[PDB]
UniProtKB/Swiss-Prot annotation:
Catalytic activity: Endohydrolysis of (1->4)-beta-D-glucosidic linkages in cellulose, lichenin and cereal beta-D-glucans
Single biological process term from Gene Ontology: cellulose catabolic process
Database matches in InterPro entries: ConA-like_dom_sf, GH11/12, GH12
Matches recorded under SUPFAM superfamilies: Concanavalin A-like lectins/glucanases
UniProt subcellular location: Secreted
KW Ribonucleoprotein (keyword) present: no
Induction per the UniProt record: By cellulosic materials and hemicelluloses.
Entry GO terms, CC: extracellular region
Superkingdom per UniProt: Eukaryota
A GO term for molecular function: cellulase activity
Protein name: Endoglucanase-1
Amino acid sequence: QLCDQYATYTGGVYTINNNLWGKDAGSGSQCTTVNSASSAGTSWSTKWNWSGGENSVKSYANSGLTFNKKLVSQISQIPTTARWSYDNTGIRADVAYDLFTAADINHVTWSGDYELMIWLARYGGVQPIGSQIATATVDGQTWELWYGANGSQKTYSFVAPTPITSFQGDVNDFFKYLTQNHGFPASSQYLITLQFGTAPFTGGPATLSVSNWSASVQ
Ligand SMILES: OC[C@H]1O[C@@H](O[C@H]2[C@H](O)[C@@H](O)[C@H](O)O[C@@H]2CO)[C@H](O)[C@@H](O)[C@@H]1O
């Protein structure tokens, strides 16, 4: 039961972090519970109540994968499944994959030269960094594609037009899209991080239950 800002637990190839990186922007608390974490997947939940700092993310409690880092151009597949639900959707928050890449394979793993997000859900109109630049079709499904930047990190967010509580896909289809359509430098960027979780702004109490998350990088 993980309540502290960087409380964490690792089982198998999964690492679950409470990751209350934004806690000083508001008032409240958040605890993350690990149900299972094995070679094959992980199940966990996080319960939070946040107020204040309404335009600032308070946290990104998440499960992250331990994998062999490699150039995005050398990746064949990133198969993943995510099944989740929120008990309370009267909130301002999003549910998302978060991936970082860097030119340095030893970059710090909480940021990148690039970031790729895949938002399975958003509540209350909260939005990714930047602006919508395209509607992208990936594996036969449409995504709003956002692009933003903070002057070091450049972030592409693929946003689901409606909530996807049971997702199965290959994240490498998204990297391929970026490489082929947006000049993403796949041959000089290492994939360094692959996480799935939720980013709350305000609301609660609310509980994200992740009944299963799996991924691999081949
Ligand atoms: O700002 C540092 C903080 O970033 C977190 O990642 C952010 C990302 O920077 C942002 O572009 C995106 O919209 O949301 C993610 C998730 O909140 C990261 O999780 C932290 O560990 C890091 O301290």
